[PDB]
Structure 1
Amino acid sequence: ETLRVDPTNDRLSALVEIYRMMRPGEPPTREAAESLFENLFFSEDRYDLS
């Protein structure tokens, strides 16, 4: 059900969709979407799990 309710089924549109979910619009063409998605959780600068 979680997959069937997902309107996007590829990796590219998923990135821009999650960026639009995070940032107030301003969708990037594989430039800021992937970078922000990797910086918000997978970056040691803005993520400091002790």
Structure 2
Amino acid sequence: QIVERFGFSEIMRSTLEKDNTVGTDEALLDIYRKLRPGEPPTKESAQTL
């Protein structure tokens, strides 16, 4: 979906190819573990936060 919608942006398309973080759940895990240090991430806590 990202590549089909935002396709002209070659610079951030290359950034995407260098994302080194695949998966929606992995993305939520990274966001939670960064913005909320010290707490154990869960499947639903990431989405609700």
- TM-score normalised by length of structure 1: 0.53
Q: Give structure 1 stretches of 5+ with no counterpart.
A: 37-50
Paired residues, what number?
A: 36
Q: Which residue number in structure 2 is paired with residue 46 of structure 1?
A: none
Amino acid corresponding to residue 35 of structure 2 in structure 1: M
Q: Does 1:15 align with 2:24?
A: no
Asked which structure has the greater CA Rg, the reply is: 2
| TM-align CA RMSD | 1.6
Which of 21, 24, 47 is the matching residue for 2:37? 24
What is the percentage of aligned positions where both structures have the same residue?
53
Aligned-residue offset at 1:18: 0.6
Q: Give structure 2 stretches of 5+ with no counterpart.
A: 1-13
- TM-score normalised by length of structure 2: 0.54
- 3-state SS of 2:16 partner: coil
Q: Using the alignment, how far apart are the partners of 1:5 and 1:27 within structure 2? A: 27
